[PDB]
Amino acid sequence: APSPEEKLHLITRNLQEVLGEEKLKEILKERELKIYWGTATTGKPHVAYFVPMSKIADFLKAGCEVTILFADLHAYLDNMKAPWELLELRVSYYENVIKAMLESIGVPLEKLKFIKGTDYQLSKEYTLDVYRLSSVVTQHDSKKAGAEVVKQVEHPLLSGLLYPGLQALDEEYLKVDAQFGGIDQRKIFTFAEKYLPALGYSKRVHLMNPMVPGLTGKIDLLDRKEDVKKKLKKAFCEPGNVENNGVLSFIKHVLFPLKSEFVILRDEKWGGNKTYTAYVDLEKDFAAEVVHPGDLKNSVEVALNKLLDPIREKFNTPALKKLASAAYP
Amino acid sequence: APSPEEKLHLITRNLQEVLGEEKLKEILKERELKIYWGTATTGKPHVAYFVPMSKIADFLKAGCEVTILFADLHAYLDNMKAPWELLELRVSYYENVIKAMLESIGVPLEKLKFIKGTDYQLSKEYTLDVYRLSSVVTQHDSKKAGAEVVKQVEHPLLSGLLYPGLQALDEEYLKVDAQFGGIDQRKIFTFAEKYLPALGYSKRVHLMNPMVPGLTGKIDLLDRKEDVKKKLKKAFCEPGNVENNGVLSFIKHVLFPLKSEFVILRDEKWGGNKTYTAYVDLEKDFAAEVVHPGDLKNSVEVALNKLLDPIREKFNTPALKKLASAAYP
Ligand SMILES: N[C@H](CO)Cc1ccc(O)cc1
Ligand SMILES: N[C@H](CO)Cc1ccc(O)cc1
Ligand SMILES: [K+]
Ligand SMILES: [K+]
Known part of the structure; x- marks a missing residue:
């Protein structure tokens, strides 16, 4: 114990929707699920963050290998919700406060993996995949995928169109089986399920929390x-x-x-x-x-x-x- | 000799339009002009290539430091006018045939610089600039800039939108004072004159040949x-x-x-x-x-x-x- 059934319950309880139940159960029958949650290093985290942190706690109780991504490049690509100079400071603030929240709710940190986007999103291999993805992703699909996530402005910037593709590639580079996020990430999640296979990568399981008031x-x-x-x-x-x-x-x-x-x-x-x-x-x-x-x-x-x-x-x-x-x- | 005036004549003769005459003359009064011409490694070069090669010959006679860019990544970004596996073979074909043309018309090759796009377009510094550029370039401007260059399809790909930005950045990374191309490159050239300064880089002189039948x-x-x-x-x-x-x-x-x-x-x-x-x-x-x-x-x-x-x-x-x-x- 926990049994595969008990793990599935801990992992999926309180979620609004689960994409990929078949694969999720196949994985849990044999090994621990690899999952990540990402957050752009933008605004100062507030009490609402305890919601995703609680699911992270559930994932760890279920034996999952959990990764938390501090998406600094994404914060920059989303209408510069943070300058590049302050990004590193905000990554530090995020790391410190998120770790503090996890310690507060009694989540063991020794097994959690913390990673910063720029740690690998500027690598040659990742960049090559960004261009490969750009060769198959239509402007239309990219704009549609980020409609509920990227700030929508009068004159859309190219950065906003790149945003979804990088989030999709993150699934492969972080070597996970699944990604957890709010239901507002759904269009990016379906985008990732459609396009990763186009690059020879596997589609991931997607867990979506409801948008909690x-x-x-x-x-x-x-x-x-x-x-x-x-x-x-x-x-x-x-x-x-x-x-x-x-x-x-x-x-x-x-x-x-x-x-x-x-x-x-x-x-x-x-x-x-x-x-x-x-x-x-x-x-x-x-x-x-x-x-x-x-x-x-x-x-x-x-x-x-x-x-x-x-x-x-x-x-x-x-x-x-x-x-x-x-x-x- | 050649005098600054004689160099200007050799450099600009037969061109349809010159952007940046003021800076061009300032440079020629003191030193040799650094200029490049790029070609995507797509279709097999034909006799029409003797036209740009003739201007390259003129630039060398004028004492210019000339660079020829084999834009392999651009060939891939332009609706995959060449698969990634064949790209390297096509770069080789282009290099061999372009050098052959230059030798045929008696252009000294010892001073010409040949470079392949992927030699630096996948570097971390260049990639960082691509993202910085994407944060200021609108989807609108990017689409407009490549209208006469990138293949226009029913469902525009994201790659087509990245194309203009990389061509602009090439001016800075190749460390040139000017870029030469056909008048069909005009919208990309004005795009580069507008956006490079946004990244702290200097605007370049642009020399445009007419579209020769x-x-x-x-x-x-x-x-x-x-x-x-x-x-x-x-x-x-x-x-x-x-x-x-x-x-x-x-x-x-x-x-x-x-x-x-x-x-x-x-x-x-x-x-x-x-x-x-x-x-x-x-x-x-x-x-x-x-x-x-x-x-x-x-x-x-x-x-x-x-x-x-x-x-x-x-x-x-x-x-x-x-x-x-x-x-x-
Ligand atoms: N889109 C998310 C914020 O709404 C943040 C994010 C999540 C996962 C990533 O791989 C990248 C960014
Ligand atoms: N756009 C050009 C072909 O029409 C090819 C090219 C020229 C210069 C570059 O830095 C890149 C590509
Ligand atoms: K955030
Ligand atoms: K060509």
Whole structure:
């Protein structure tokens, strides 16, 4: 144990869609799945990142060989969401904060592989494949593949058209069996399944998380407890409304996978604390309005601060404080 | 001698247009001009290539540092006008036949620099510049820049959009002051003048030859004398018509620059042979119809076979015969 079935459950739970179930099961019957998740080194990571980090935790529990890609070249190709000089600083910021999040949720880092895009995306072999891919990929398909990912501007830049192709090639160069990302990556994922074979490379399994609403409808990973409270003070959390609820979503995608349970802090007057072992049970109580928005938020606030504490402490140094400012002037 | 003025004349004679006269004169007042001409390693070079070779001869006579680029990657990016496996064979064929043409017209090869695109177009520094360029070049401008150069197909490939940018970057990596090509390269040349400065590189001088009508309205450099005659037997050469005349054009752009004169072979009955020292004088006589199409063609046929003889002899070996067949199955 875990059995192939148990691994499949851990790997696919909470996902919106799985592409390649046949191959996925063939792999799990014999060996560990090789999978990666990529993130362009753009904006400062916020609490929403705990969502993909939770799936990464699931992959490791399932015995997967996991790689995290810091896509610095992609950040540059996406309408320069980060200058080339600041890219290296942002890669550092991302590496430090992502590792901090993983340590916070108790994910062993000794087995995770961290890689930067420019570590191999400028190599001759990779570049040759970019040109080979460009010879078969139509301008049309490239533009369509990145519609929901690359910033759409009035006068589209050539860089935006290259973006999808490099993400596809990353699957082969990182030597993975699968790629995990949000459902917003779907068009790039299908693009990769169609074109990698054209270059003699295998199509990969694709795991897609749903687009989860945020807690603030953003809470920075380094925000002080005071700001966390203030930002939570809002958040779309209407009584009895279980849809488009960022607070419930955070519990479903982050807290339950982490602790396997969720405790609602509630006054004795209204029933006292209650421990839920399944998200569906909590949702039922929220819909019945026996779990008040204020108590739901307070319960998440306590749990979130527990996740952020070690992170805020880690970055409480002159060096890291300097990096944060340098990476984001 | 040659003086800066004499060099400018040799460099610009017969051209349709010169972009950058100010800088060109500034350079010639102090040093030798660095210039290159590129050719994608696609179809088998034919007699029309003597036109650009004649300007290359002019550049060398003017003391220029000349580079000839065998653009193999470009041949691949232009709707695969040559597979990657055959590219190296075609580069070899091009190198051998272009050098043969230059030797035939008496151009010293010891000072000419021959370079293959893939010798540097796959380097990390060049690749980084391709991505930097892609961040500022719009899809629109890239498509527009190659309209008259890259094969236009129903479903445009991404490779076609990259083509112009690499040709622009070639100017910087080949470290030249200018680029020479046909007027059909104009949109790529203006594209390079606009975008290289965006990357901190200098705009280059651009020399453009007119689009010269061919002798056959194609005569291969290795065609036997019998086939040369047969193909010349046709050719658009109407009596008294000095426009769109491929025979007159070959004399103007190749034979006059080579010999500084042109001899018309004509029977005593019609005036006997006549030696012209200026193309305009020959054109006047052709317009007056005192130089018959048949005699004009015969005069060019004799001169052309003199140019092809050493080339046909050079490739009259088992090795080169094998290469020709291998490069073009
Ligand atoms: N497209 C992703 C951000 O939406 C980031 C990315 C993921 C995987 C890669 O191989 C490259 C970039
Ligand atoms: N575009 C040219 C053929 O029409 C070939 C070429 C010329 C110069 C270069 O740097 C690259 C390709
Ligand atoms: K990001
Ligand atoms: K060519």
